[model samples]
Target: EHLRELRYRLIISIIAFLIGSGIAFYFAKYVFEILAAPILKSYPEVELITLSPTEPLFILIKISLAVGFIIASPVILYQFWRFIEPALYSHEKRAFIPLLLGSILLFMLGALFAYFIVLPLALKFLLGLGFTQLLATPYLSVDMYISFVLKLVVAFGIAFEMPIVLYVLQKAGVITPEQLASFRKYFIVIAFVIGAIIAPDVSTQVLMAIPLLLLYEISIFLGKLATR
Candidate 1:
């Protein structure tokens, strides 16, 4: 039954992905411009390349794939729930509602934060470092640039989902508010550590850490609510 359910969900997800890909391809140029906007704004003179004749074609396909997934995510998420909901009771379904909402909301918030705040700062810092330290031109291929941007955005999106993860775990009786509270001090340190790894400048690191710490506190508060 589980395997059959998996197959059903897979088919649905695949179909949704294909439909999304078609739409994305239809607007691939527009989507590419949007994705390229930050990079261009960060470094006006930045040049991108294609090493082979087929590389540009491949890059378009790759970007289309990402856009397709973004478009189809909601459908994929629904399909997953439909596949699994049959095994869950009414109470379990109720418990999952908040998780689903928070996951989507937080992921979008994180992605936007990365795009609007972090990316520009990080890019400027990187360019400054390169000009000062390397004394070399920095060139990016379209594929490479897209990969970099996508990874950064996705990383932020996943990071922002931490609060929801904590709340859900608490709801599942896997963790307590006390545990989260106790870890507050340690989390601050870890948050800064993550910021340091992700951001090149101290200011950027602080920016990243501040939100991370705030989210940890929010997670604790939500966990308390869940437990109570």
Candidate 2:
């Protein structure tokens, strides 16, 4: 039964991914426009460059793949829930849906946090500072830009799952609410580490810390609730 369920879920997730990829491929140009506009505003003459001809084609493929991941998240998440359901009781279903949906919502929050807030600050700091010197403000590379955005979105999306992740740890008896609460001091340090990797700047890191710490607090709260 478990194997059968896994197979079913895998098929569903694959379908979701294909649909999303198709949509992304169909709208690749528009997607690139929306994503690149902010930097264009900051640097009036900004344009994406490619050292190699194939880089442009590859970037489009990467974008479509990314879109596929986003589209498949829900189906994938639902499967994750179903896989873990045997460990839960009937009464827990109510709480489970909210947590599952909350996970998805938080995932989006992280992505949006990166796009609207973190990315902008990082761009300003990196560009406005002096890395370019006299290098014409550094024309963005097509592959580089897409990959940077990819790393960012994936990083933040996973980071935002802190609450849900730690809660599962509690359920698995690996850690308790008090234990998570005790890690509060580590939060600031970890926040900076994650920020450094995600955005390559300080202000973005500091701003990101706010959400991460908040998620930590939510984790403790959920841990407490799980015990009740």
Candidate 3:
């Protein structure tokens, strides 16, 4: 029965993804422009190259698929929850929907932060890394750039879910609010360390670190409420 239910949920999610990809394919160019805006804005005349004739087409399909998946996420998540809902306790049902919504929202927030703030700064800094006493030109491949941007977006999106993960663990009785709260000082320092590692500049690092620390605090607060 569980296997049959899982199969149906997968089918529904797949259909939704296909429908979303079809819609996104029509706007693939627009999505590409949005992704490449930072680079193009700075270097208006710089060219991006495709090594193979089919590379551009493949990139278009990739971007369309990415956009489609994001658009279809809510439906996919709903179907997923429905499949698992029968197994959940009554109290679990109460928190499940809110957690799903919070997860999606935080994921988008992290993606946006990476796109609007992190990407542009990182792009600019990397582009101007070496001083040119002699003539030099930089050519970025479309495939490489797209892949890099996608990784950053996805990484940050997952990273921002730390609070949600912590909250769920607390509710599951795996950890306590006091234990999480005790890690406050450690997280504060580690937040800056992560910011430094991932962000391009000190200012950008500050922006990233502040959110992490804030999210940790928020998680602790939520965990406290769950315990009560």
Candidate 4:
């Protein structure tokens, strides 16, 4: 019965993803435009170019499929919760819906933060630095830009859920809040390394590190609440 339920949930989630992707696919270019508005607005001549003829179409469909995956995450997450509830207490099961909704909202908030605030500002900074008169501001490649955007979105979105993830693990007796606190220094270093890797602009690493540190502290507090 559990396996059957899981199968059905997967089927329904896939259907929703296909439908959402189809809709978003129609406006894929526009979606990319919206995402790229800040960069283009700042550097009017600066444009995204594809080396291959098929790159444009490929990017469009790729973005649409990625959007579909994100839109379907809530369903996927809920299905995961359902799958695990057999091992949870009745009270724990009761908390599942709120947790699910909270995770989705937190993820969306994080994505928006990285996109609207982080991406635009970082783009501006990176473009501002140019030493040679002969060399123009580097034109971003299509694949590079797409991967950059998605990477930041995913990193921020997942990091923002620190509180939720830690809380669950703490509640399940996996890790204590104090234990998390003890590793704070390592966590900050890891965050900076990740930021440096994913961010196109070098300056973004410090800015990104701050929020991640904040989230870490906040997660410890949340974990403390769970222990109480």
lDDT of 3 by residue, 50-160 (tens): 877666788888888877877787787677657754464235667678867977887788889878876776665556455531332446678866765665676577677
TM-score: model 1 vs. ground truth: 0.70
lDDT of 1 by residue, 20-120 (tens): 98788868878778988987766766766765666666767776877787677667766765675556423466656665665677778888987898777
Measured by TM-score, the strongest candidate is 4
- Tens-place lDDT digits, model 2, residues 39-151: 78877655668868655778778878886687777777787777765554334667778878988998898888878876777676656665563555456676766666766
Ranking by lDDT: 4, 2, 3, 1
Model 4 accuracy (lDDT, Cα): 0.77
Judge candidate 1 against the unseen true structure and give its global Cα lDDT, from 0 to 1: 0.73
Quantify all predictions' global Cα lDDT against the true fold: 0.73, 0.75, 0.75, 0.77
- The lDDT leader among the candidates is 4
* TM-score, per-candidate, Cα-based: 0.70, 0.75, 0.69, 0.78
Where in model 1 is the C-alpha error above 4 Å?
A: 1-3, 52-54, 83-86, 89-102, 130-138, 177-221
